[PDB]
Amino acid sequence: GPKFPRVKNWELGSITYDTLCAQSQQDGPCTPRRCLGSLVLPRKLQTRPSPGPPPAEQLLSQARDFINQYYSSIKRSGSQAHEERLQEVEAEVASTGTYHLRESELVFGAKQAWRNAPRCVGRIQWGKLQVFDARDCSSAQEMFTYICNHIKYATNRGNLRSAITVFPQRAPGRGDFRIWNSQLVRYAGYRQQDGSVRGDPANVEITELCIQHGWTPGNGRFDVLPLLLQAPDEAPELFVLPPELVLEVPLEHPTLEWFAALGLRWYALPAVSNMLLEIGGLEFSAAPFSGWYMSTEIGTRNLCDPHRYNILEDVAVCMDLDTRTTSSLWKDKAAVEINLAVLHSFQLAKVTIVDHHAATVSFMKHLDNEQKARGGCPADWAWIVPPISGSLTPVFHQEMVNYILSPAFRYQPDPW
Amino acid sequence: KFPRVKNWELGSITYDTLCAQSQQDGPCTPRRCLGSLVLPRKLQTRPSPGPPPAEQLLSQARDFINQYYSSIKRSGSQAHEERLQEVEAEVASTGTYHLRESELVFGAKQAWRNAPRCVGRIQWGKLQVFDARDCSSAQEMFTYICNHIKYATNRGNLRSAITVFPQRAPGRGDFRIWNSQLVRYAGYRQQDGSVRGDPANVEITELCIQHGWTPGNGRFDVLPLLLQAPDEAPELFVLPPELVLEVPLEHPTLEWFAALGLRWYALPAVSNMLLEIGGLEFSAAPFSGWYMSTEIGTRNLCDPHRYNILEDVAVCMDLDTRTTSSLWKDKAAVEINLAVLHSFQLAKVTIVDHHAATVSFMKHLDNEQKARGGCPADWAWIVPPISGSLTPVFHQEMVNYILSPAFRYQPDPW
Numbered sequence: 075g076p077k078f079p080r081v082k083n084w085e086l087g088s089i090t091y092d093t094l095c096a097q098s099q100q101d102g103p104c105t106p107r108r109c110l111g112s113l114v115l116p117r118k119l120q121t122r123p124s125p126g127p128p129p130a131e132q133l134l135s136q137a138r139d140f141i142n143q144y145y146s147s148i149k150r151s152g153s154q155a156h157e158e159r160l161q162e163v164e165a166e167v168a169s170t171g172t173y174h175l176r177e178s179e180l181v182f183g184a185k186q187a188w189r190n191a192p193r194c195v196g197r198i199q200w201g202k203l204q205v206f207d208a209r210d211c212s213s214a215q216e217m218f219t220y221i222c223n224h225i226k227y228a229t230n231r232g233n234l235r236s237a238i239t240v241f242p243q244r245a246p247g248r249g250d251f252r253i254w255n256s257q258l259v260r261y262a263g264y265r266q267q268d269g270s271v272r273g274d275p276a277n278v279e280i281t282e283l284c285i286q287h288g289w290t291p292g293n294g295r296f297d298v299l300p301l302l303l304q305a306p307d308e309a310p311e312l313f314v315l316p317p318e319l320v321l322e323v324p325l326e327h328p329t330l331e332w333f334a335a336l337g338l339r340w341y342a343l344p345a346v347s348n349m350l351l352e353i354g355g356l357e358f359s360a361a362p363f364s365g366w367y368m369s370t371e372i373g374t375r376n377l378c379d380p381h382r383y384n385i386l387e388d389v390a391v392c393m394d395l396d397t398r399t400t401s402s403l404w405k406d407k408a409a410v411e412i413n414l415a416v417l418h419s420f421q422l423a424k425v426t427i428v429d430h431h432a433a434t435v436s437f438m439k440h441l442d443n444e445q446k447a448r449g450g451c452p453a454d455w456a457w458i459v460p461p462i463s464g465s466l467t468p469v470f471h472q473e474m475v476n477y478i479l480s481p482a483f484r485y486q487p488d489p490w
Numbered sequence: 491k492f493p494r495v496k497n498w499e500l501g502s503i504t505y506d507t508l509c510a511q512s513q514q515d516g517p518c519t520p521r522r523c524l525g526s527l528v529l530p531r532k533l534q535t536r537p538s539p540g541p542p543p544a545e546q547l548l549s550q551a552r553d554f555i556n557q558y559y560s561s562i563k564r565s566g567s568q569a570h571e572e573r574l575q576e577v578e579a580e581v582a583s584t585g586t587y588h589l590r591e592s593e594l595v596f597g598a599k600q601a602w603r604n605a606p607r608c609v610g611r612i613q614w615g616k617l618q619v620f621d622a623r624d625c626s627s628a629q630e631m632f633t634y635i636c637n638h639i640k641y642a643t644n645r646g647n648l649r650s651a652i653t654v655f656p657q658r659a660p661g662r663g664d665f666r667i668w669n670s671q672l673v674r675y676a677g678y679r680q681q682d683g684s685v686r687g688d689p690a691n692v693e694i695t696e697l698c699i700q701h702g703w704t705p706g707n708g709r710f711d712v713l714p715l716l717l718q719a720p721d722e723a724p725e726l727f728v729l730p731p732e733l734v735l736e737v738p739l740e741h742p743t744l745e746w747f748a749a750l751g752l753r754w755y756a757l758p759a760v761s762n763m764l765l766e767i768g769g770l771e772f773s774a775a776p777f778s779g780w781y782m783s784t785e786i787g788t789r790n791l792c793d794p795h796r797y798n799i800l801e802d803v804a805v806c807m808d809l810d811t812r813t814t815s816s817l818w819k820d821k822a823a824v825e826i827n828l829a830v831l832h833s834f835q836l837a838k839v840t841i842v843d844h845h846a847a848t849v850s851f852m853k854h855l856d857n858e859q860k861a862r863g864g865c866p867a868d869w870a871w872i873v874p875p876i877s878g879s880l881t882p883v884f885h886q887e888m889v890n891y892i893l894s895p896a897f898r899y900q901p902d903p904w
């Protein structure tokens with residue numbers, strides 16, 4: 075039949091073919107010999123710091139492709155305006171080695187990068203992203219102002235709104251604008267005398283960096299970290315987020331009255347800040363984006379991963395379960411109640427959140443929309459299927475094709 | 491070249507060098523990954539009316555023969571050289587060759603060891619291999635199958651086993667077991683399209699009826715076997731009820747669970763896969779071990795396209811099925827899995843929970859890293875269908891590739 079991947083949904087028995095993958099111009103880590111789809115960080119999209127200017131030929135081809143994508147999106151492909159823009163880009167790159175995007179092109183590209191993210195289950199919302207243009211930012215202090223504005227707009231007192239703030243693109247020879255923190259809101263991780271960690275173990279390095287740079291540390295389990303913001307060719311500067319701007323949700327359980335006593339909590343805004351936004355060859359090294367949480371992110375991964383808060387055993391003990399044997403399914407029982415507590419608490423505090431069932435159902439709709447609109451949707455099965463109750467959600471039974479499309483969000487080396 | 495494999499829970503790293511020994515291609519390419527696809531688009535197993543290229547078969551055969559003598563620490567030995575000549579001579583004169591029982595045993599165990607989707611491979615060394623190549627009729631296939639089931643069931647103390655029927659031969663029909671497993675429950679289509687029993691077995695159920703089987707009308711009617719000898723219509727055989735051990739499902743604390751009338755068989759015996767050893771193909775080689783509880787409690791009983799009992803259990807539990815956010819599905823699934831474990835344990839029937847299983851697989855990965863420099867594994871199949879990240883394998887990166895000997899999918903014989 076069709077010379078494209080045949081994709082089947084085993085729950086419904088339906089079949090689709092992915093023709094969109096044909097547009098991928100960037101190779102992933104797999105080969106006919108072996109599949110490396112499970113690797114979290116495969117040395118592929120890795121946007122290593124490339125000081126020397128990018129090959130004008132490579133950049134130009136990437137730029138032309140993007141401009142073509144833009145004009146096709148506004149249904150003016152092949153038009154005079156299209157050819158004139160292509161000429162403007164080539165001319166600008168010719169005399170300067172690089173080029174700049176028009177406002178509308180940046181908005182289109184940022185939304186397309188989200189739309190193209192294979193690991194994001196919230197993509198049905200891709201068209202509603204609010205793009206803040208911060209390409210005029212010229213200092214770390216101003217970065218903080220833009221970030222604070224992003225946080226206030228995005229949080230919106232609990233009725234969260236997707237948003238991305240785009241700071242100046244990388245420029246040949248010149249230093250990058252960088253946000254050192256992995257997220258705008260993160261809890262400190264303090265190494266202890268015995269070797270253990272108080273707080274979030276995932277943030278030990280950034281916490282120590284904040285200290286090395288003048289931050290007076292606290293000693294709690296949920297201390298919000300300050301931000302290390304860096305402007306071109308300058309040492310990073312430290313900024314403490316005004317507490318009133320960081321909305322948090324104390325965790326309680328709907329029926330287990332003792333759960334509130336655990337003193338657990340989490341912040342409302344998930345804002346990834348260390349990824350690179352690539353559009354038509356241009357690289358935006360500082361472009362924090364945010365949406366709202368899918369509950370298993372907090373309840374299962376952040377709170378129960380062995381290398382994170384690891385609270386499974388503490389909650390199981392409180393539930394008086396047999397943590398002495400696997401067959402009691404104590405981990406499963408505790409995890410369920412922890413996830414329920416998260417949903418219950420966010421709902422009580424009127425803070426946007428989506429459970430894994432609702433999220434995956436909406437992602438199935440997204441897949442259907444994209445099948446019609448683009449002939450497919452790049453998706454990373456391992457990241458799309460929730461960490462708990464996998465096969466109880468519709469995406470588990472949906473085969474998926476994973477590939478890289480641009481514009482895109484990519485991992486980049488740490489600035490230190 | 492060799493992939494860096496990281497375990498995110500422990501921060502440890504390893505390098506898979508075993509993948510370089512892969513001579514068979516998967517469905518992925520640098521342009522796109524198709525790792526979540528269940529069945530092969532082209533990597534199927536085309537007909538055997540004509541003999542495979544002598545050089546291709548010979549190369550696969552020599553490699554296998556090499557693997558064998560290396561396993562018994564006798565490479566380069568006189569026996570090794572003589573065996574290679576025997577194989578060469580047979581292929582050159584007949585276009586095919588035959589394995590000696592010791593080689594077949596080694597090959598069957600290696601195929602299991604190489605299965606990327608199997609989480610129970612720590613047991614790979616203990617596999618009872620039954621040589622059924624001395625079989626010339628459907629009736630004889632039935633006798634071997636019944637003996638397989640008796641041995642493997644062992645009154646609830648399950649033992650891993652495989653029975654190997656005659657290999658495929660050029661231009662001749664295949665020996666085949668039409669059923670997907672030796673023990674399966676019927677699936678009867680009814681008036682309004684619904685299905686009574688296991689929806690996954692509708693087609694096979696109908697084929698049996700079409701071949702003379704008098705259908706029952708329950709939700710758990712054990713199906714008869716359709717066994718086929720070369721170029722002959724398949725024959726119907728009813729398995730003796732006393733050979734099929736089943737476990738009634740009840741819950742440790744929820745008295746009403748037992749009232750659901752749920753049950754499941756003790757022996758999981760896949761019978762429609764092809765066993766490939768040294769270029770040779772065994773179209774009928776049913777194998778079995780024991781169940782990991784999520785297979786029954788989560789997939790078989792809760793999949794939307796299977797028994798789909800989630801809502802029934804949720805109602806008996808009086809959960810708030812009004813919204814997804816009450817996590818009623820999650821709560822019910824957990825109790826159903828607990829009921830499965832409780833019931834098998836009560837009935838003294840072998841079974842392993844997903845935590846114990848994944849823990850053993852992590853040990854297997856370490857054992858294999860030391861022994862062969864890696865282990866082919868399919869993450870989507872290794873990580874359990876519920877509580878994924880609550881198990882160690884979720885946090886372990888894996889490399890998937892095809893090694894031979896191997897178990898592979900093949901077209902349905904109808």
Ligand code: HEM
Nearest residue numbers: 188191193194195196199236237363364365366367368483
């Ligand atoms: C509207 C709400 C949204 C939801 C519920 C959602 C949910 C998720 C989830 C569950 C993941 C995987 C999390 C993990 O396992 O670490 C993810 C990954 C991702 N999302 Fe979204 N997302 C949303 C909004 C956004 C926005 C606004 C953007 C970008 C403009 C975005 C970009 C991405 C990217 C690039 C990743 C992958 C990051 C990585 O590789 O580590 N998401 N999202």
Ligand code: HEM
Nearest residue numbers: 602605607608609610613650651777778779780781782897
């Ligand atoms: C001893 C206990 C065993 C356990 C606990 C076990 C468990 C599993 C599990 C959970 C799967 C995935 C099942 C699914 O999701 O449908 C699987 C797949 C598989 N197992 Fe095992 N296994 C065992 C014994 C065996 C034996 C003895 C063989 C072969 C000699 C074997 C060969 C395979 C193969 C080839 C697959 C993939 C089947 C497919 O692609 O559908 N397993 N096993």
Ligand SMILES: NC(=[NH2+])NCCC[C@H](N)C(=O)O
Nearest residue numbers: 758779780781782785786790
């Ligand atoms: N543990 C095993 N040997 N499993 C083999 C696959 C059986 C299949 N998952 C079933 O539910 O029947």
Ligand SMILES: [Zn+2]
Nearest residue numbers: 104109518523
């Ligand atoms: Zn792959």
